Every structure is written in C-alpha cells, then in structure tokens.
Paper text:
The HD transcription factor [name] plays key roles for plant development with at least four distinct and essential subfunctions: Firstly, regulation of stem cell identity in the shoot apical meristem (SAM), where it is required for non cell-autonomous induction and maintenance of stem cell fate via stimulation of cytokinin and suppression of auxin signaling. Consistent with a broad functional portfolio, [name] has been shown to bind to a diverse set of DNA motifs in the regulatory regions of downstream genes involved in SAM development and signaling processes. Here, we have combined molecular, biochemical, and structural approaches to address how the [name]-HD recognizes specific DNA target sites. We find that the DNA-binding preferences of [name]-HD depend on appropriately arranged sequence motifs in a direct tandem repeat and that homodimerization is one of the key determinants to achieve high sequence specificity.
Author numbering: 39 to 103
The structure:
C-alpha cells in the first residue's frame, strides 16, 4: 500500500491539526472510511501509518536527528 497524495494530506491534517498519535480502533475505522473516498486503503494501513510516525518522532528526538 502506498497512500495517494490526497490520502497523505488527510493523514497529515489529522496528525498535525488534531495531534493524533495513536488512534483508537473506532477512530481508525472512521479515518479509513474517509480515506477510502480517495483510493484503496485498509484499516491496518492507517494503524501502521501512525505507528511509523511514532518511530520517526523518536528518531527526530535523538542527538543526531
């Protein structure tokens, strides 16, 4: 799975406007339903997108990050 550009923009809006980091399972279902209007996507793709960003935040907080 690779998000479409529009899906990425929506995911970043949720991440930076709502400050979502670890959505509930109900949130993942609702987010997936909206993202599906812009292309293929499954709920686990949303779960892992937020998980991958947690790892990226940890990298940005290291000395050489």
């Amino acid at each position: 799975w690779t998000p479409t550009t529009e899906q990425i923009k929506i995911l970043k809006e949720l991440y930076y406007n709502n400050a979502i980091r670890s959505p509930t399972a109900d949130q993942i279902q609702k987010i997936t339903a909206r993202l599906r209007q812009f292309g293929k996507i499954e709920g686990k793709n949303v779960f892992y997108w937020f998980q991958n960003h947690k790892a990226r935040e940890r990298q940005k907080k290291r000395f050489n990050g």
